[PDB]
Amino acid sequence: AIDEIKSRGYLLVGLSADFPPFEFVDENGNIVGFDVDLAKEIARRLGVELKIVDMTWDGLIPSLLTKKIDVIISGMTITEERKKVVAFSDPYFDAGGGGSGEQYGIAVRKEDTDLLEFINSVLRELKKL
Ligand SMILES: NC(=[NH2+])NCCC[C@H](N)C(=O)O
């Protein structure tokens, strides 16, 4: 998965831009927010451009499974149910503090274990700061 993204020259991140402050569309029509910033960080570290694909919430896992996006970064709670279908990064946002509550993760296809590893190393470096 990594070599393919690097050859393509961009990282395709799906989200649903209706969830400020994680992703939303600002007053100039730009998609912005915490998840966009994180997506940019990951893309930079991969040495690729970022392409954000905005879609309806329900569209995201399908698009991931069918390879139209590489990852979901869209305020998605890590849950045991969803782990039946996708893999999740380490948590990057804790809604409750102390790891209580919803923890958000980056969803990746289960077979893309190299991508998942890579993302985890970026989250681990960012948390070190
Ligand atoms: N971009 C969005 N609409 N995100 C909604 C996230 C809601 C909730 N954290 C979930 O994972 O279902």
Numbering used by the authors: 1 to 129
From the paper:
In the last few years, we have characterized the arginine-binding protein isolated from the hyperthermophilic organism Thermotoga maritima (TmArgBP). Although substrate-binding proteins are generally monomeric, TmArgBP is essentially dimeric, with the concomitant presence, as minor components, of higher oligomerization states. The three-dimensional structure of the protein has also shown that the arginine binding does not only produce a remarkable tertiary structure variation of TmArgBP but also a radical rearrangement of its quaternary structure. The biophysical characterization of the protein has also revealed that it is endowed with an unusual stability against temperature, chemical denaturants and pressure.
Although both domains cooperate to the anchoring of the arginine in the wild-type protein, only D1 is able to bind this ligand when considered as isolated entity. Due to the different numbering scheme adopted for TmArgBP D1 (see the notations section in the Materials and Methods), the mutation is F57W and the mutant is denoted thereafter D1F57W. The domain was successfully crystallized and diffraction data were collected at 1.79 Å resolution. The asymmetric unit of the crystals contains two copies of the domain whose structure is very similar both at local and at global level (the RMSD value of the two copies is 0.31 Å). A comparative analysis of the global structure of D1F57W with previous structural characterizations of D1 in different binding states or embodied in the native protein indicates that the mutation does not produce major rearrangements. The inspection of the binding pocket indicates that the arginine is anchored by a remarkable number of residues that establish a variety of different interactions with the ligand. A remarkable contribution to the recognition of arg is provided by the mutated residue W57. The values of the side chain dihedral angles (χ1; χ2) that the residue adopts in the crystallographic structure are (−178.16°, −92.18°) and (174.49°, −108.34°) for the two molecules present in the asymmetric unit. This observation indicates that W57 assumes the rotameric state predicted by the computational analysis reported above. The drastic change in the local environment of the tryptophan explains the variation of the fluorescence signal associated with the arginine binding.
